[PDB]
Amino acid sequence: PRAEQKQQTRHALMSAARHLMESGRGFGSLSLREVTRAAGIVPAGFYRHFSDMDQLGLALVAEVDETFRATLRAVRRNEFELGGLIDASVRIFLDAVGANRSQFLFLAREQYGGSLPIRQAIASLRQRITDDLAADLALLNKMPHLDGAALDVFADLVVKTVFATLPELIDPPAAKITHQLRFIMIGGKHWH
Amino acid sequence: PRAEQKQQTRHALMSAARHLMESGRGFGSLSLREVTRAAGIVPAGFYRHFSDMDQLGLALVAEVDETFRATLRAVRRNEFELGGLIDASVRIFLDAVGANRSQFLFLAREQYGGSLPIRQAIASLRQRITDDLAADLALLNKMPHLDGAALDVFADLVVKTVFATLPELIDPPAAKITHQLRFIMIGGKHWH
DNA sequence: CATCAGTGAACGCGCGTTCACTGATGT
DNA sequence: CATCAGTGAACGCGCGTTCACTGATGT
Lengths: 192, 192
Fold this sequence. Notes:
The structure is a homodimer.
Chain A: H1 4-19, H2 32-39, H3 53-77, H4 85-98, H5 101-113, H6 116-139, H7 148-170, H8 174-189
The structure holds a DNA duplex.
Keywords (chains A, B): DNA-binding, Transcription, Transcription regulation
InterPro entries (chains A, B): DesT_TetR_C (IPR054129), Homeodomain-like_sf (IPR009057), HTH_TetR (IPR001647), HTH_transcr_repressor_FabR (IPR050692)
DNA-binding region (chains A, B): 31-50
């Protein structure tokens, strides 16, 4: 229908809030009014799309989750090959961040600093990412010296490193992060 | 003098802002009014201590920096012994966090989410921590296969891991972080 | 008597939310 | 005529900041 325009306006509010953040400001500090101002609706017109700012926040988590998971599926598609696994996936990853700066900006900025339902939605998307990593590694016996409990700890260290590297990939890398993921992988290989 | 009372009030504003954060809220979202309300002065009485909220933020970075560096000096004091280096220092560290929850809370929460001068003051304290780590490691030839450029990358990975572990050490560990730092150390040892 | 940390009233402003509304889309 | 996304005016409230002030500390 032309409730496609309703959707286009919802994307405007969303894209407007993310973009308003690219200046160091956090999602909790954004007013409904300024977001509507930026997106091109009069304040009360926010309520046709979200009940409040928190709800917009939640929709921003879902948007980035979807993008983050699409990238990791691309990385997952390359792990069945042999050699150069790290370099190739760092590249796939860095491209996806490049192509979606403001989404990963939101995630990097809110990963600890948001409201409650936003902190929780992020912790959740992160646990899934971590569980998927532990399941990838287990599948291909890529870390044989590591049992289920150890893989969980390993995958947590890798995801943590990635999440903690996001801020660096937006403000201003490839070789450095690759170098760093190697230290971790080497540590998993020679474990014991 | 009894400008010791002036200092006591300054500590109240400071401790008041940190503590007001323990509920998931970020420093940028705190009003001058609520901080004064919490600390026990009437709003305009903030200005005898700080020109604005940013300046309070800056003083909170300096406070935690000082505490963080005192902990790392304690960890540094144990690195000249042999064996069990990781376990002992994780313990020293976790105690210092325990003893200063709200300070590390501020740091963990603002490490990426604050204003500009606050983001910059934190990046600075972090670079110093990282440089000190790279200098410790170099001093004791603890990572012989690593040249100056490699140590910088290694120390960045360790500090990043620590900073990224802070949120977990306040909201709700020892074995997990120790386990994780081992993967990293092993990776540094067997590098090449 | 001198200093000055903290007071208490006042201001103008942007906020979130409500409400009856308008007018194009889709029957 | 029916739906409903977006309008525009209005409200009460908490904000940051100013100002002349008070009264204990320290001369």
